[PDB]
Scaffold this motif. Structure first.
Motif, PDB file in Angstrom:
ATOM      1  N   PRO A 242       0.827  -1.210   0.000  1.00 48.72           N
ATOM      2  CA  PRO A 242       0.000   0.000   0.000  1.00 48.72           C
ATOM      3  C   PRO A 242       0.859   1.256   0.000  1.00 48.72           C
ATOM      4  O   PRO A 242       1.817   1.379   0.767  1.00 48.72           O
ATOM      5  N   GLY A 243       0.508   2.191  -0.886  1.00 48.14           N
ATOM      6  CA  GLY A 243       1.252   3.413  -1.096  1.00 48.14           C
ATOM      7  C   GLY A 243       1.993   3.449  -2.418  1.00 48.14           C
ATOM      8  O   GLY A 243       2.209   4.537  -2.968  1.00 48.14           O
TER       9      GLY A 243
ATOM     10  N   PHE B 109      11.051  -3.605  12.755  1.00 51.74           N
ATOM     11  CA  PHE B 109      11.376  -2.317  12.155  1.00 51.74           C
ATOM     12  C   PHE B 109      11.321  -2.372  10.636  1.00 51.74           C
ATOM     13  O   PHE B 109      10.999  -1.365   9.994  1.00 51.74           O
ATOM     14  N   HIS B 110      11.627  -3.528  10.042  1.00 48.94           N
ATOM     15  CA  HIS B 110      11.481  -3.668   8.599  1.00 48.94           C
ATOM     16  C   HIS B 110      10.028  -3.552   8.168  1.00 48.94           C
ATOM     17  O   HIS B 110       9.755  -3.354   6.980  1.00 48.94           O
ATOM     18  N   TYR B 111       9.091  -3.677   9.103  1.00 43.22           N
ATOM     19  CA  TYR B 111       7.688  -3.424   8.819  1.00 43.22           C
ATOM     20  C   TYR B 111       7.295  -1.987   9.131  1.00 43.22           C
ATOM     21  O   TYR B 111       6.607  -1.344   8.331  1.00 43.22           O
ATOM     22  N   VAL B 112       7.743  -1.468  10.274  1.00 46.77           N
ATOM     23  CA  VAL B 112       7.295  -0.155  10.727  1.00 46.77           C
ATOM     24  C   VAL B 112       7.946   0.950   9.907  1.00 46.77           C
ATOM     25  O   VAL B 112       7.265   1.849   9.400  1.00 46.77           O
ATOM     26  N   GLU B 113       9.273   0.908   9.775  1.00 43.30           N
ATOM     27  CA  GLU B 113       9.971   1.979   9.074  1.00 43.30           C
ATOM     28  C   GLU B 113       9.556   2.064   7.612  1.00 43.30           C
ATOM     29  O   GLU B 113       9.519   3.161   7.044  1.00 43.30           O
TER      30      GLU B 113
ATOM     31  N   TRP C 215       7.893   5.046   5.702  1.00 48.47           N
ATOM     32  CA  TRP C 215       8.514   5.490   4.458  1.00 48.47           C
ATOM     33  C   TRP C 215       7.492   5.652   3.341  1.00 48.47           C
ATOM     34  O   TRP C 215       7.634   6.549   2.502  1.00 48.47           O
ATOM     35  N   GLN C 216       6.462   4.801   3.311  1.00 52.65           N
ATOM     36  CA  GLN C 216       5.406   4.957   2.316  1.00 52.65           C
ATOM     37  C   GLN C 216       4.651   6.265   2.506  1.00 52.65           C
ATOM     38  O   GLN C 216       4.181   6.857   1.529  1.00 52.65           O
ATOM     39  N   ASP C 217       4.526   6.731   3.751  1.00 54.80           N
ATOM     40  CA  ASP C 217       3.899   8.025   3.995  1.00 54.80           C
ATOM     41  C   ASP C 217       4.813   9.172   3.585  1.00 54.80           C
ATOM     42  O   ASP C 217       4.331  10.215   3.130  1.00 54.80           O
ATOM     43  N   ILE C 218       6.128   8.997   3.738  1.00 50.91           N
ATOM     44  CA  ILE C 218       7.072  10.046   3.358  1.00 50.91           C
ATOM     45  C   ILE C 218       7.008  10.299   1.857  1.00 50.91           C
ATOM     46  O   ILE C 218       6.898  11.445   1.406  1.00 50.91           O
ATOM     47  N   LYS C 219       7.072   9.230   1.061  1.00 49.90           N
ATOM     48  CA  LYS C 219       6.962   9.372  -0.387  1.00 49.90           C
ATOM     49  C   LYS C 219       5.565   9.832  -0.784  1.00 49.90           C
ATOM     50  O   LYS C 219       5.395  10.881  -1.416  1.00 49.90           O
ATOM     51  N   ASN C 220       4.550   9.052  -0.422  1.00 50.77           N
ATOM     52  CA  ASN C 220       3.165   9.363  -0.753  1.00 50.77           C
ATOM     53  C   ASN C 220       2.393   9.649   0.527  1.00 50.77           C
ATOM     54  O   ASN C 220       2.105   8.715   1.291  1.00 50.77           O
ATOM     55  N   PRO C 221       2.035  10.902   0.805  1.00 50.71           N
ATOM     56  CA  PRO C 221       1.392  11.215   2.088  1.00 50.71           C
ATOM     57  C   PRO C 221      -0.015  10.642   2.181  1.00 50.71           C
ATOM     58  O   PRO C 221      -0.768  10.626   1.205  1.00 50.71           O
TER      59      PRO C 221
ATOM     60  N   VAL D 245       3.217  14.864   7.639  1.00 52.45           N
ATOM     61  CA  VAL D 245       4.293  13.882   7.601  1.00 52.45           C
ATOM     62  C   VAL D 245       5.218  14.102   8.788  1.00 52.45           C
ATOM     63  O   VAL D 245       5.685  15.221   9.037  1.00 52.45           O
ATOM     64  N   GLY D 246       5.484  13.029   9.531  1.00 51.29           N
ATOM     65  CA  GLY D 246       6.240  13.110  10.760  1.00 51.29           C
ATOM     66  C   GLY D 246       5.402  13.290  12.006  1.00 51.29           C
ATOM     67  O   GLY D 246       5.947  13.214  13.115  1.00 51.29           O
ATOM     68  N   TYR D 247       4.098  13.517  11.859  1.00 48.90           N
ATOM     69  CA  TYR D 247       3.195  13.752  12.987  1.00 48.90           C
ATOM     70  C   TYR D 247       1.914  12.952  12.777  1.00 48.90           C
ATOM     71  O   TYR D 247       0.852  13.512  12.482  1.00 48.90           O
ATOM     72  N   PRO D 248       1.977  11.627  12.930  1.00 44.79           N
ATOM     73  CA  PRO D 248       0.786  10.797  12.693  1.00 44.79           C
ATOM     74  C   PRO D 248      -0.202  10.905  13.848  1.00 44.79           C
ATOM     75  O   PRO D 248       0.163  10.738  15.014  1.00 44.79           O
ATOM     76  N   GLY D 249      -1.460  11.180  13.519  1.00 45.45           N
ATOM     77  CA  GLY D 249      -2.496  11.321  14.520  1.00 45.45           C
ATOM     78  C   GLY D 249      -3.085   9.986  14.929  1.00 45.45           C
ATOM     79  O   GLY D 249      -2.516   8.918  14.689  1.00 45.45           O
ATOM     80  N   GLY D 250      -4.247  10.058  15.568  1.00 41.88           N
ATOM     81  CA  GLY D 250      -4.968   8.845  15.927  1.00 41.88           C
ATOM     82  C   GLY D 250      -4.367   8.173  17.139  1.00 41.88           C
ATOM     83  O   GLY D 250      -4.093   8.820  18.154  1.00 41.88           O
TER      84      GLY D 250
END
Ligand code: CHL
Ligand code: DGD
Ligand code: CLA
Ligand code: CLA
Ligand code: CLA
Ligand code: CLA
Ligand code: CLA
Ligand code: LMG
Ligand code: XAT
Ligand code: BCR
Ligand code: BCR
Lengths: 193, 154, 42, 97, 198
Positions: free
Chosen positions: A4-5, E98-102, E106-112, E131-136
């Motif tokens: 996704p993304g 971390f290979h899952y989280v980072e 990273w997908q949010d960094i490229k595509n918000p 970006v850098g401030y995920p809510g929820g």
């Protein structure tokens, strides 16, 4: 979506069985290659779905691992043993010529027929129970087959790599080693020797 | 040890070279007076020779049958100080030089006479660019991902 | 004055000053750390 | 252990495969391959007097077209495989596991 | 007037001032490209956050040990200690997680806004932030992500990154930990300085 993304490739619509959008190297850029790969993938998937049961079932019995169950041919006077009984055609030249003639004939029949959907999903005599009756459950089973096959392929890679990390072992023997101590007997010890 | 070599701390030829070198300098020393300036110079060279041989034997240098330090550049972690570590240091310095010179050529390429600032250096511009090579592996890597390092279609 | 500074920025003079400073630095480095076939600090 | 047994079985199976199994694939591949040609035209048309293929020897009353050359090719396969099998059985070579 | 890192020097043009912690500091011009600026903002946030947690986990257990309340190994000696799992197993667990989280970050960094929802549970998604401030779920106490608050986060991250840089270099040359260095300095600062240590 397999990631996704990430935007999907142009030629992977999502209609093909198993179309999750995975082609980073764009190997299926050509439809000729993509259709040929769709056939070759199912062939590897089906060989693995036959291999994994045949690799781990004799290990649950008294027979050794799949690596030692192919060992009589190394020594001169080898004698095969299916279910602990020495079969008469256990010599390597016998099985080698037998496998060559039969496997080459049948696998070459797949080459001589190009549809190219018969190369993927033939059926007819290979579907006596007729699970291809409904073109919706038949495509659903296509999804079930490709995912079962990819699962067996990943398992075959695991069996071979574990066999490298522990020369002369069994997959279930490696499982028992992990069950003895999951926190001290993990891949980390072969990743960090 | 590796490749049949023996560590210089264990080699007899290595210690015999240190002996014969020091004794050769001492043979030159007997000709001069103990308070002489050539004497203090030869004594300093002898002390410098002892320091050199001791340092080579202390840092795990391997010696051949000739008693001379042989370097192992295969990447063996016991001898990274012999090539890989100084090589990374070089590549840092070389990239610094090339990146700063490249930044200079880019800055003057839009001048009225770009050749003027190539035979007469713009030292103010140079002094402002010499410290961009400190972060050259970063600025270069970003210019690689953004398509700024390579000229399109050349 | 400005012409004199422009002369000092010419290629040979800038090269001499730069290479003289470089030569002196490497000489002092090999003076406080002579020989050294390796990177000993690991 | 018997030379006539290995040679007859190997050559018989080779001729059998080349006639009934590996025949249509071989002919369709040699058809799409074609005759070798120089300057966009065959060697014979260009002016090589000795580059005319002998269609008379390729004549065969066999229903599928198996002629003398097909016998020679697949028979050479059978004999080479036969003598390979025989030579590999008599050497007594054995690796060490 | 947004704060001048050097009162004399002018601020670069590409550093507008709309970014928290902006003081016009970029002498080498690494963020001249706005895409480089966008990537380095996330790199400063993550490096600052890891440095803040690291400096805390290095300093606070050690001062509590030197006082006498607890006995916790020092930050450099905490790795040689024995734990319930093999260090190699701990490595693989940390790598996989971390290979899952980072990569999700990273997908949010490229595509918000492309990884705001849970793929396992279709509901329970993240509201739209920056970006850098995920809510929820990442902001349970529902604080206000604003200026000053974000500026204090970056400021603490910068000081903690300098703090980590101090801890590693000190421990290399001094042999002991950060709180032991402070006690040695407090006893006699005029004769227990980096001048005396070397
Ligand atoms: C991410 C940053 C990080 C840093 C800065 C360090 C730094 C250090 N670790 Mg370490 N580790 C780090 C992450 C991790 N370590 C370990 C597992 C270990 C072990 C098992 C050991 C260390 C040890 C060490 C020290 C090596 C001796 C040295 O450098 O002396 C100058 C050192 C201070 C060693 C130690 O304690 O040395 C005294 C040691 O035995 N680390 C894991 C789990 C896989 C980590 C995961 O992120
Ligand atoms: C100790 C532990 C903690 C450490 C934390 C890190 C600290 C690092 C601090 C660095 C700065 C300290 C000293 C600053 C003194 C003022 C120098 C200056 O006026 O610093 C700023 C100058 C100029 O800044 C920028 O410089 C740019 C470079 O282009 C210019 O380059 C030249 C500048 O002289 C010419 O003017 C030329 O015409 C022009 O192209 C642009 O001019 C920008 O507009 C301008 O803002 O740069 C420069 O000299 C850069 C010089 C500093 C490089 C530091 C490298 C450190 C390794
Ligand atoms: C040889 C087996 C094989 C083949 C022929 C294919 C073929 C195909 N796959 Mg598939 N796949 C496989 C194995 C295979 N797959 C396995 C094992 C998995 C599980 C990880 C998957 C999971 C998968 C997904 C999720 C998807 C596909 C998809 C596709 C289709 C498009 C991709 C493509 O065109 O690339 C062609 C592929 C090749 C030309 C094979 C190249 C093999 C290289 C050279 C070696 C592989 C290196 C490998 C990582 C080594 C590991 C070994 C270990 C010791 C480390 C295509 C028809 C996509 C699709 O849309 O389906 C229609 C899709 O979304 N595959
Ligand atoms: C295409 C998949 C595949 C392949 C290539 C093999 C291959 C093999 N199997 Mg196997 N097997 C498979 C699937 C497969 N199996 C499956 C799906 C099962 C579960 C029903 C089994 C259950 C099984 C058992 C219980 C045994 C083998 C054994 C063997 C080995 C000797 C077979 C023999 O003696 O002659 C052919 C046998 C018949 C035609 C019947 C051989 C290497 C034997 C062995 O372990 O070797 C020592 C053994 O006893 N297999
Ligand atoms: C779980 C894996 C799986 C799945 C989901 C499918 C699914 C499908 N297959 Mg396929 N196949 C598989 C594995 C699988 N296959 C394997 C391992 C082989 C051997 C290489 C084949 C060879 C094959 C051929 C030649 C053909 C299909 C066809 C089809 C399609 C229609 C027929 C059907 O639904 O059969 C139903 C499947 C089942 C009812 C699975 C139940 C069987 C049990 C669980 C087996 C377990 C016993 C043991 C482990 C295996 C021993 C059996 C062995 C002796 C054969 C369908 C989409 C046909 C097609 O394409 O249609 C046009 C077609 O011609 N398959
Ligand atoms: C590419 C060819 C080459 C290479 C690889 C070397 C390499 C070396 N030479 Mg050599 N040399 C060469 C050509 C070469 N030389 C030629 C052609 C001549 C004839 C002019 C000489 C004459 C020569 C002499 C007379 C001496 C050397 C010495 C040395 C050693 C000293 C290392 C040092 O300076 O300490 C370390 C220096 C540094 C780490 C400086 C880098 C740090 C920078 C400036 C700052 C870092 C910022 C971060 C070194 C291994 C010396 C020696 O004793 O050998 C053991 C020595 O006395 N060379
Ligand atoms: C990202 C920052 C960071 C990192 C990498 C570590 C890493 C570590 N901590 Mg630490 N810690 C941190 C922040 C951090 N801490 C902070 C902010 C605090 C509060 C000030 C603590 C308080 C703390 C205590 C009291 C202890 C550790 C301990 C440890 C070590 C054992 C791991 C563990 O606790 O088991 C797994 C963690 C689970 C939550 C399960 C380990 C190296 C323990 C130790 O020293 O090892 C014996 C120990 O007792 N930490
Ligand atoms: C078309 C032409 C193509 C040509 C291609 C040519 C290729 C030639 C080879 C290229 C690659 C060579 C790699 C060789 C590696 C040697 C080191 C080794 O395998 O031993 C294994 C080495 C051994 O390392 C040694 O060990 C010794 C004790 O046994 C001592 O401790 C030595 O000091 C230590 O150096 O261990 C490693 O350091 C390897 C760590 C690798 C970790 C990778 C993790 C990330 C993976 C991704
Ligand atoms: C991430 C980080 C630290 C993280 C530490 C961690 C997780 C520690 C973990 C553990 O300790 C615990 C808790 C417990 C222990 O038992 C185990 C370990 C494992 C030890 C530091 C980052 C540290 C990051 C630092 C120091 C960054 C500094 C960057 C600077 C100063 C850049 C400045 C400039 O770039 C500008 C902005 C503009 C340019 O033009 C000019 C220059 C000057 C180049
Ligand atoms: C490890 C090692 C080794 C090996 C090696 C190898 C084999 C590799 C490689 C490599 C390679 C093969 C690389 C590459 C390259 C490529 C390319 C393609 C390039 C490039 C470059 C560039 C692009 C540059 C840029 C720049 C910079 C950045 C700096 C300055 C400026 C300039 C511009 C110059 C040995 C054993 C020897 C030794 C030990 C170590
Ligand atoms: C009449 C008829 C028939 C029969 C047929 C037959 C029987 C035939 C044949 C045939 C054959 C049977 C042929 C063969 C062969 C061939 C060839 C051509 C050969 C060869 C050989 C070789 C080539 C060799 C080589 C070598 C040498 C010289 C030495 C060394 C070793 C080697 C081996 C390498 C039938 C009924 C069926 C059908 C109808 C018709």
């Amino acid at each position: 979506d397999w990631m996704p993304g990430q935007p999907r490739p142009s030629y992977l619509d999502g209609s093909a069985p198993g179309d999750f959008g995975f082609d980073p190297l764009r190997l299926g850029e050509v439809p000729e290659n993509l259709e040929r790969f769709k056939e070759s993938e199912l062939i590897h998937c089906r060989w693995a779905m036959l291999a994994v049961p045949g690799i781990l079932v004799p290990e649950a019995l008294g027979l050794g691992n799949w690596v030692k169950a192919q060992e009589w041919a190394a020594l001169p006077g080898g004698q095969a043993t299916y279910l602990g009984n020495p079969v008469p055609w256990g010599t390597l030249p016998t099985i080698l010529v037998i496998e060559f003639l039969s496997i080459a004939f049948v696998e070459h029949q797949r080459s001589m027929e190009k549809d190219p959907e018969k190369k993927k999903y033939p059926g007819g005599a290979f579907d006596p129970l007729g699970y291809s009756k409904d073109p919706k459950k038949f495509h659903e089973y296509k999804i079930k087959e490709v995912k079962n096959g990819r699962l067996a392929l990943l398992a075959f890679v695991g069996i071979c790599v574990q066999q490298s990390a522990y020369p002369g072992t069994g997959p279930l023997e490696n499982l028992a080693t992990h069950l003895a101590d999951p926190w001290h007997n993990t891949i980390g010890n072969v990743l960090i020797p | 040890d590796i490749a049949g070599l023996t560590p210089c701390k264990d080699s007899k030829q290595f210690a015999k070279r240190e002996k014969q070198s020091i004794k050769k300098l001492e043979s030159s020393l007997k000709l001069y007076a103990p308070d002489s300036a050539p004497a203090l110079a030869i004594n300093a060279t002898i002390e410098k020779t002892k320091r050199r041989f001791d340092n080579y034997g202390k840092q795990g240098l391997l010696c051949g049958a000739d008693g001379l330090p042989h370097l192992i550049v295969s990447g063996d972690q016991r001898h990274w100080g012999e090539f890989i570590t100084p090589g990374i240091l070089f590549l840092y310095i070389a990239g610094w030089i090339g990146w700063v010179g490249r930044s200079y050529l880019i800055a003057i390429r839009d001048d009225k006479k770009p050749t003027q600032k190539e035979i007469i250096i713009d030292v103010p511009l140079a002094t402002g660019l010499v410290f961009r090579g400190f972060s050259w592996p970063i600025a270069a890597y970003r210019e690689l991902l953004n398509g700024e390092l390579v000229a399109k279609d050349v | 004055m400005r012409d004199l500074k422009t002369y000092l920025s010419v290629a040979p003079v800038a090269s001499t000053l730069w290479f003289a400073a470089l030569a002196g630095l490497l000489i002092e480095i090999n003076r406080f750390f002579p020989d050294a076939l390796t990177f000993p600090f690991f | 252990l018997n030379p006539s047994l290995v040679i007859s079985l190997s050559t018989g199976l080779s001729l059998f495969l080349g006639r009934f199994v590996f025949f249509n694939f071989q002919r369709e591949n040699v058809a799409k391959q074609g005759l070798p040609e120089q300057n966009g035209v065959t060697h014979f048309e260009a002016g090589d007097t000795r580059a005319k293929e002998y269609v008379s020897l390729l004549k065969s009353n066999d229903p599928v077209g198996f002629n003398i050359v097909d016998v020679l090719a697949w028979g050479s396969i059978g004999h080479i495989v036969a003598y390979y099998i025989l030579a590999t059985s008599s050497n007594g070579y054995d690796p060490k596991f | 007037k947004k704060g001048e890192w050097l009162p004399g020097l002018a601020s670069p043009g590409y550093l507008t001032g709309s970014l928290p912690g902006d003081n016009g500091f970029d002498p080498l011009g690494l963020a001249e490209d706005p895409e480089n600026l966008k990537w380095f903002v996330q790199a400063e946030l993550v490096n600052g956050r890891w440095a803040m947690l690291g400096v805390a986990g290095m300093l606070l257990p050690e001062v509590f040990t030197s006082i006498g309340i607890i006995n916790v190994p020092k930050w450099y000696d905490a790795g040689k200690e024995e734990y319930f799992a093999s260090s190699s197993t701990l490595f693989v667990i940390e790598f996989i997680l971390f290979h899952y989280v980072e990569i999700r970050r990273w997908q949010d960094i490229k595509n918000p806004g492309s990884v705001n929802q849970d793929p396992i549970f279709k509901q329970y998604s993240l509201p739209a932030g920056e970006v850098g401030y995920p809510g929820g779920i990442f902001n349970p106490l529902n604080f206000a992500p604003t200026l000053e608050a974000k500026e204090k986060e970056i400021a603490n991250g910068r000081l903690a990154m300098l703090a980590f840089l101090g801890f590693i270099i000190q421990h290399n040359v001094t042999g002991k930990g950060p709180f032991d260095n402070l006690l040695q300095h407090i006893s006699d600062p005029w004769h227990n300085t980096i001048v005396q240590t070397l």
